[PDB]
């Protein structure tokens, strides 16, 4: 029951890092063997860090607008000493190009591995809208 | 090599059972704590086996019309000893109500746990089209 | 903590009783001075029991077609010692007129009162889709 | 009978404070454990104050264009000594972007609780249009 | 304040009489010099009692299906000692030709005069949907 | 019999003042406890004078386009000595925002009371087009 | 004056013949050099005016199933002292083919020559919607 | 003969005064007691020339383009020494804001009066185009 | 030189075989390890004979209507002694379900291998419209 | 053996040159008078490397912009000893002129031959899109 | 077979002349009676060479930069000993006024005659696809 | 001079024969080695009579609706002794789907050869609208 919290704490740290656009923190946690599905990939399974490395240098470079992100009803499933999974729903708020505020919803999955006592992410699934809000 | 093979073996068997409509085989493999994302849930994190039992007794009792399911390029990780993850793309061939062939795509994720003796599925995630064709 | 339980138990009983069309049972939980917003009222605050009595002779009596009701993540506030407020989301499954499955979502609110050693309902707010299934 | 009045007076104060785009007065009433269903939440249940704070910083107070708010036929229950619920309809008048008058209708619910000599809100349900009018 | 109750009681009696198709009861209260607006006149100010006699032999002779009538928030003015005005909303519940229920809304006005110790109706104005339900 | 004329004289002045855009005249004739049905109320029953003050300040006061109004075949009932009911039809000819002439129809009802020796309106009904000009 | 009533009575007599619905009576009233037109006649303007015959057939074919009639707000001009012009708006109520009651409207222009026992007409233009505006 | 000619001549004079906007002559030909059915009104019996005046003062101030008209199939009959009927189809020729060739059409009636030796029109029936078209 | 001929004959024979649905011949020429791009694959590389087997077993077998083909400007290379490539443009004629005439266009590439003295196709690449006829 | 790594070096070298304006690499690998399918010619079978020479030397050697190329699950067949066939899917990452990142999907094919030991590509086929993306 | 090639080169030089001052030589080589019809002519007889250059002028108006063109699968007949006709398809690669690469396709015909031992073009005909909407 | 006449006469005979769908006659005039361009070929150099044979069974066989064909501004070149060229304008009239005649224009160019003592067509280049009428 204690581990669940630190798993959720780690997930929050990861989401915060990607939002702030620090490639260093993302690289530290993400296992180079990471595999992910995103709408950015047009529905093709993608592997490796290089694919995401592009966005940290040209997309989030403009991440200056006011946004807010909420995490709803996280569910953590424990399957072993160094294995765990987490699922949750994600709500984000932002301001569109018309000056109005907008909201979007997306559900996500992540699988965590602990080699050498340190958690790392080895999978990622995003459904619905793209991670970056549409404006 | 060996373990990566049989994870695919079980996944193939599970996909076969759901297509055939056999409730017992699906019940055996699936873990009691199973969660799921899928379009049938309108974006909610459904849990348990009660929700899916509705479909088996009513809709999938018939598999008359032709259908062909294919799995392309599976990727499997092994976590620790008794945990693994599998990601793959699925192609479904079916005939529509107008009697013409039609193909649909969907990418899916799964997390497998083996407590002591039998592999079991604890989480699921289907993005895009539903688990069955739109006939 | 136990108080938060019997409320959810009662709410589950009331929803079950409505789905079975047994008006007699529904007349005990509900306080005579009931009020409610629901789509059937066209956005007007209805009061009393006579309004709902109509449905319990023609429509809900014929409520025999297969259906499944799910309650997701209820939340309860305990006010004072003899009152409470509960909110939740509701998922319904039904077979439409085309022989296909469907799902509908609607959130709800309820206020419970405890005079005379029993729990009773004194308000009800339903958004989104109608309470009854759309077969 | 007097207690049935100050609840209405308090509700009017809260609506005015929201309309003026002031946050300090808003916090002094709303309970820290507030929950609410609003269209801005896309049908989910949102807890806490942090979610609403975003709106008060970018949208409400920026223009304050001419508008009028009307409350019709409030209905109030008195539960115990420190609990009450209120239901009402709300008509709003505003000028659209085309320079023409418009109207919009919505119904709302609230639950009040008074620990330590102060009425405080713990639940809020809004159907139809959201709290903010569609200008 | 005493007069208001009897006026409302009279109005309810009148609505009951028309529903049951008793022309004699309708005539006993309504003043012979009655005018009325309603969709049945296509927007023409009708006058006299002959026009409405047509409905009490061919329209209500056919329709006998179950129906329920509700009256909401009646308001009454007193502008003398033998004259009064009443305004209210009305909701009707009826079953259409598909074997399913539906609701209709209309708002109405009436003017009452009291010659010979008896209240009499002199005007009527049904807005929105017509007086009768559309099955 | 002459009273049937002065009522029409007052009604004509009331409509003229409404069209012109001055608020003082409308206030004097209209009783403070005035009710009203009109499309701008979205089918609800409004009370008081403030609901219209918004219209006068923004739209009517700024009316600067040619339009025409006519009254066809009024009917007047005299009840008591200080009360009477008037019904009539209203054809409005207006130059639209496109600088083109167009016609629309609407029927109305008004109830008149004369305390202290001045006639005043206590109730108002309108159908079809809105009370305000359709420019 | 009195002669205004006489023409009114004769108009009812013409109506009486119309319910009988015999074309010979129609020919009797019409002057052999009468005029009439309508676009539904493709603008044809002849004494026969078969377009009148067209909706004479449709309307009067209903008479096997009972009908009722009504007229409103007649207006009369006496030409010199030897001819009379009469106009009005006519309401008719009928049972349709589906068994539902109906109402129909028809404006009318008629002119009658003084000579007693030989009254005849030179013109008529039903116009408006002689049969049905929009079904 | 001479009679029938001058009515037609007058008929044209009336038409020219319309297009030229010579209201004073139009007022001279038309009896102040004129009455008319025409689509400009929604089936009502307008009285006087004020309703038509709108189609002269504020319309012709900007509605002025080279325009022509053709009179088709006149047919007249005489009644007594001061009464007669004239019926005619009218074409109006001008190009609107579309490249398609254009020719509008109207068909009309007049009933004629000669008090004191000067002819005048007392009743007027129409259909199709208004007194003046859009430009 | 003749080698560039026989290859073209083989490709023409293959096209005829698939047109007539002779599964055996198609299997004989097609290598067991065939790859393929085509519109039906939604841009996914599909290997083996099972994927195409669906068309023969379901559609082509039942389909008995005729078909005709046009092949334009083939270019063939020569590599080694058991390899070759062919590129060309294609135009095809057939009959639909309604029987009305239908002609299709496609542009296709193929690669051939000749081990064991028998020419066999190991790769294929279509474009544009679907390979299968649209009946 | 070691063919998959062979294509890695060979295909990488070809792709790198393609993304650059140099023609030496393109000329050396390609085969003179070779057909190739690219949407640049609308399936006109661009013959000879000279077609690509014109654009690469003159225009396409523009200023580079941040772009990224990806290759997914390539498949290789080895024909005889001096030939091979390769298929794969190419995802292109680029930033459009609006300043927003974008991705595109396009599948390809290539046939390789070893003339006198050194490898040479004697065919090329691009589907879905051309070699280069559009900004 | 040689005579089939000389025609091609004569045409190849002639086509290249369009891009140089040799266009006058192209004019000189052709019969002064040279004539052609073009898709956009719709009755405008042209000298053949002029209209084709006019297309080239349009491209150079946008381009005014160096050009490359290609000719594919030429077809040449042999008629008599002093006549011949050629058919071919032409592609042009150019840089647009926006600086981006572009391509165009054309279909051409030419008639050749050799009096006095000099090949003279006596009839030309081009073909493109400039459909009117939006190019 | 006389040689010019027969060229036009034969072309008329071929065109008329084309209109009548008499494929056998068309097969005689046209040389077996016919080359042609046309919209149906999508800008491709078709060869042989097989492609054209299709139209003479489905489309040209049903050519029974009224049609009119005209020849304008014919011009003929005489090359050598057994060759000649013909160019002209073409106008076709036909009844469209709306039942209104339509006019279409199309320009051609042909080359005739005279072996065996008879004229035959060895080229054809149609532009603009298709050969067949667009009914």
Numbering used by the authors:
A (entry chain B), B (entry chain I), C (entry chain N), D (entry chain D), E (entry chain K), F (entry chain G), ...: 408 to 542
What's the publication's text?
The calcium calmodulin protein kinase II (CaMKII) is a multi-subunit ring assembly with a central hub formed by the association domains. The AD hub, which evolved from bacterial dimeric enzymes, extends the β sheet to form lateral contact interfaces (LCs) needed for ring assembly, while the ancient dimer contact was preserved as the vertical contact interface (VC) in the mirror-symmetric two-stack hub. Linkers with variable length and sequence between isoforms and developmental splice variants, connect each AD with a peripheral kinase domain (KD). Here, we present near-atomic resolution cryogenic electron microscopy (cryo-EM) structures revealing that hubs from the α and β isoforms, either standalone or within an β holoenzyme, coexist as 12 and 14 subunit assemblies.
In order to determine activation-independent effects, we engineered a CaMKIIβ holoenzyme construct with alanine substitutions at both activation (T287) and inhibitory (T306.T307) phosphorylation sites, the βT287.306-307A holoenzyme. The T287A substitution blocks activation and aids R attachment to the KD core, while the T306-307A substitutions countered the dissociation reported for human α hubs by the addition of R peptides phosphorylated at these sites. We obtained three cryo-EM reconstructions from the engineered β holoenzyme sample: a 14-mer (3.0 Å resolution), a 12-mer open ring (3.5 Å resolution), and a close 12-mer (8.4 Å resolution). In addition to the polymorphic hub structures, we obtained an open hub structure lacking one dimer from the β holoenzyme sample. The open ring structure is the first near-atomic resolution structure of an intermediate CaMKII hub assembly. It has 12 ADs but a diameter similar to the 14-mer ring. The ADs adjacent to the opening are blurred in the top view 2D class averages with lower local resolutions. The vertical dimer on the right of the opening shifts 14.6° down off-plane. We utilized the 3D-flex refinement algorithm for analysis of the motion in the open 12-mer cryo-EM dataset. The analysis indicated that the dominant collective motions are the enlargement of the gap by 5–10 Å due to weakened LCs between the adjacent ADs.
